[PDB]
Design a protein around this ligand. Sequence first.
Ligand SMILES: Nc1ncnc2c1ncn2[C@@H]1O[C@H](COP(=O)(O)OP(=O)(O)O)[C@@H](O)[C@H]1O
Ligand SMILES: Nc1ncnc2c1ncn2[C@@H]1O[C@H](COP(=O)(O)OP(=O)(O)O)[C@@H](O)[C@H]1O
Ligand SMILES: Nc1ncnc2c1ncn2[C@@H]1O[C@H](COP(=O)(O)OP(=O)(O)O)[C@@H](O)[C@H]1O
Ligand SMILES: Nc1ncnc2c1ncn2[C@@H]1O[C@H](COP(=O)(O)OP(=O)(O)O)[C@@H](O)[C@H]1O
Lengths: 352, 353, 355, 128
Amino acid sequence: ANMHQLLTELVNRGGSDLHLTTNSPPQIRIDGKLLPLDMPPLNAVDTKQLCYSILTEQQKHKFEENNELDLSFGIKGLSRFRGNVFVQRGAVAGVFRVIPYKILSFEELGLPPVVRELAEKPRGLVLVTGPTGSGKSTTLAAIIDKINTDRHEHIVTVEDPIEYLHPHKSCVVNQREVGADTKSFKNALKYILRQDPDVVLVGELRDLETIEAALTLAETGHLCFATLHTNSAVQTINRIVDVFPSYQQPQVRAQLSFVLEGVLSQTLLPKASGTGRVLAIEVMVPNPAIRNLIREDKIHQIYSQMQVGQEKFGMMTMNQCLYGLLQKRHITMDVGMGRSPDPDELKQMLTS
Amino acid sequence: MANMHQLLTELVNRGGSDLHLTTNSPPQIRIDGKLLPLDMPPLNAVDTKQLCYSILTEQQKHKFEENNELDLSFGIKGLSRFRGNVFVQRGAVAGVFRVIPYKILSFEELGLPPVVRELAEKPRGLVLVTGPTGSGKSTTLAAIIDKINTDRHEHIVTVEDPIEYLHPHKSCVVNQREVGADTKSFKNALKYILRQDPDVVLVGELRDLETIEAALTLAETGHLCFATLHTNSAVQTINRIVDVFPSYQQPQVRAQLSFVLEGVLSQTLLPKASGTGRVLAIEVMVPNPAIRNLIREDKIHQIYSQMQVGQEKFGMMTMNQCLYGLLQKRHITMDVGMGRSPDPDELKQMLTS
Amino acid sequence: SHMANMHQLLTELVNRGGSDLHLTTNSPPQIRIDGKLLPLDMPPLNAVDTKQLCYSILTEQQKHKFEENNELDLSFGIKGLSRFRGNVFVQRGAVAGVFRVIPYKILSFEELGLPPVVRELAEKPRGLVLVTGPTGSGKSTTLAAIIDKINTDRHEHIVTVEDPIEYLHPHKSCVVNQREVGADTKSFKNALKYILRQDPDVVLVGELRDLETIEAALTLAETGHLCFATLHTNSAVQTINRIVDVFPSYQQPQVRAQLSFVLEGVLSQTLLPKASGTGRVLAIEVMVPNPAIRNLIREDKIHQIYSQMQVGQEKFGMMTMNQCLYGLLQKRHITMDVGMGRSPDPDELKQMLTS
Amino acid sequence: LGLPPVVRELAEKPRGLVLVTGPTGSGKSTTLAAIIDKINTDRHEHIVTVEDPIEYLHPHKSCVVNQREVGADTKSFKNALKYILRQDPDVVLVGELRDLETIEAALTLAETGHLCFATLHTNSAVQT
Ligand SMILES: Nc1ncnc2c1ncn2[C@@H]1O[C@H](COP(=O)(O)OP(=O)(O)O)[C@@H](O)[C@H]1O
Ligand SMILES: Nc1ncnc2c1ncn2[C@@H]1O[C@H](COP(=O)(O)OP(=O)(O)O)[C@@H](O)[C@H]1O
Ligand SMILES: Nc1ncnc2c1ncn2[C@@H]1O[C@H](COP(=O)(O)OP(=O)(O)O)[C@@H](O)[C@H]1O
Ligand SMILES: Nc1ncnc2c1ncn2[C@@H]1O[C@H](COP(=O)(O)OP(=O)(O)O)[C@@H](O)[C@H]1O
């Protein structure tokens, strides 16, 4: 009955994570920063009692065998949660994440209209990138949900774990969870071409084999969605090419020039109001000039090409996005400057 | 049990640096660099085993008997924490014990340049602190961790073998996992670290292939990762990390390294010209756009050329540039500066201009 | 009675100054004196004899281990006599054994024929000192004399890693810890993995078998410690080349730079039969690095180091092998054939004789 | 399929190694099915295919056609190829030349008077 109250406080306060460890009060991450609750500090008896209060008997066994445990659980009327229990300095510790279920609209997410146009693409590779917790899964869920609403096609997702659930609308939606429904990303992608897909979500471009799978899907007539942890379009494109040996990079660059349809690099920044976060996003939509630049190995010039395609194609550099957020007073100058990849350009952009 | 308490108490009270326990000698304490025997009868093999085992857990006893080697740390309430090494010689247990101070020195007390303070403010990336064993790496890391703890409202996780410096919660939540007790291994701790909502992670030495991938993944997914190696320069550090991997996977490591590297600090402690104490010599590499491309393009030899002229703007500093400054302040001798220069000819050119 | 024979055979080995006792079937017991085997005046042994004699000095666990593998290395003491290193094996279906003497008494520098510059090496605060030569060329005896001088004079921590431990060093002014590979520590690599956490001042690492041991020895010497190691090389230049050339070409520049800073002495030894026909006398090449030699190492001009050694005798206590053979020849300790048979350049030694 | 006339003449070769290469989904299996079907139609020989998985089925025409699917009919390419010389083949499809062992099987089949078909993921004759 105490663990219930703590998870209730986490939800009510709009927090993302609950942390339980000795010699500190419970702490909740809100808008990316930890805030301690107005409670006495926990001891080792407390952390074990609190964490064990949400475990099954079999789960207590596995944790004591390894001093590690991953799990998920639900609290009726509240939310499901992702938990990790571990041991530090001889005492139990726990971290508990909230599992969103409701898909927000493109405008609630702060996504510009061009992202809505990406859900209509018949084939190609669309990459959504950024750091952990930069909105990638929510953006993807909005795109996938629009396809589910609008098309009569087959969507297959491979996820680790599944985050957002897509009940069938006009599409048939099959969602495979790594570690339960399928052994691995590699095994799921081995059979995906024999599963008659139209739209496939493959997750992060972790290694060479998954990149070849996404390029093959995109060039064989499918719309393929994937993620990377990179922070810009140029940085994203380089990270796909540079994984391959020098001798095979020309083909990958040629493949990317044909199948790439969009790169979205996101980051959530604290709002100037002090409550909540706002999306900063760089949007690159390839035009003929950029596709040629990829093939000719002149990737360093793509940023300059993005600078002049805003009105026509819906492109937007990070700095142009930061410029709009600064003009609307959604973020502070220090936050905007802190994320600008070129503060001198943004300063020029602000005073021009 | 209550005897080992007394020997460690005498070690601290007497200002010793190290306590030595071995057979056919009384306990000896190193004072001002030289060993002094305590006024006690010589120890036998029963004594050394009992004394060393009195400060061990059952897990630690088993692991020592499995390997005949053991590093560990422990605390004596009201006195101090200590680092221990237990080993076997001539069929008998032996032990050496160092003191671990409660107070973490500041960047200025440690002789660290202002760029090290700015590394403690990095919101993401990979920072490497390198050098041989006992070259000051843990002391520098403790200063960095403590500043983040003071200044940020974030989650710091350390995996250590063993834990040396303890970081009670300040503004951060700090969790410290000791290998062999809190967690089975580095591999196991890093397998779950990504589900523990960390912001800053200390992973220890990049001792094998699997830990580097864990450290690279942590750094590229938006976390600040600190790690150590045994190397003496930025180029040796960068080369050592990529080349340990099979040739076909080095491209990904180079792309990853070019993206996540935020600083490499290579340290060595040198004797002070006064003859008492040591002074820090440090090579600092801070990646600029030019350097990140060279890592990505497998042009490591050109990384060194970029470092000689970026000193004033970003706080970068080659070892030779640091040695030049130590020589100008007359903190070190010519033999020491030349004896640690990776290119004495370059240092000669800087001196005679 | 079997034990009483093994004791008498091992006692005879010590009183007659033999180095090794050999027991095998169809031969009498034989003892090695000054490198050459001599049979004792006894009937030849059979398989019953060799098994009983060798087993008389083994523990029950050692007999069991021997019977599982047909191999056994061990050390043991005979109260009032000496300690010994034994190996028992099987040949032609019968037990055989070899037993070496481990002397209790370390001889002094002058008794061993070591020049005074070797005494000064025991006073070095840090660096790498290499003692090289073939098997049984006196390397361990020289190292024990140096370590004994450190043990006597300093209040520091000496750690040895040995395969196996030969000379035992009681604590004198130093604290001496000696780790035997295969019993005290799993391997040289594992012992060296922890040596920096054991607060050493002086470390003996044994033979520079592999890259990891060379890197460990260079690190010890770079971090302010005095490190002793051995190789099987016959000259200073050959020794330096052996260390550098085991590394890949791309990392050899650093090794040469490292060696040039930390190297403090190279001793290459060989024991030669005396002219009188009894005993052996030490011939030694001694290299003590000066600023000129350290540069030759960094510049990859290794083979030019010998010319520097020819002229550093009076100033730095240096000495080439040929300079040593000259002194043994003028004092008539060795014959002309023995001295010439070992000169790396007999024509140079010839010129030194006629001058 | 848009294959030039020289491809039909390759289907008449009595022996040797024929490689059909390209990236995934570039038509390789379809081209190979056209070649095998002509052989099945034209020859009185024994065709064995090893496939992971089987993509095109060939009912017997003038040839005897045996098709082994990895993971069901046979444990692996390695296991199927160890016995193929003892199965009296004339034409063999071995799939992708993924490792050194499979290449040696294809070169040996092609050298001992058999017609061997295999694929690679290379993009040109020289690269292949
Ligand atoms: N564009 C966005 N605008 C507003 N809130 C967002 C946005 N994206 C994500 N969020 C919220 O912040 C959290 C982080 O999003 P997430 O899907 O986990 O990104 P990632 O998968 O990259 O970690 C989400 O749970 C969501 O509630
Ligand atoms: N810049 C420094 N100035 C003075 N003392 C230092 C300095 N750096 C390290 N030390 C001292 O060195 C000793 C051991 O350092 P340590 O953390 O073990 O380095 P490492 O783990 O890399 O070998 C510590 O007691 C520390 O006080
Ligand atoms: N300089 C020396 N002078 C006289 N006798 C020596 C000398 N060095 C060694 N001896 C004797 O010769 C024997 C063989 O030498 P040893 O220590 O086995 O050399 P190594 O270390 O190369 O194996 C020793 O037992 C020792 O008693
Ligand atoms: N010459 C061709 N012309 C048009 N479509 C083709 C052709 N060859 C194959 N296809 C179709 O393209 C898809 C992929 O071809 P596939 O035979 O699977 O090539 P691969 O075995 O190299 O991956 C198939 O489903 C097929 O129907």
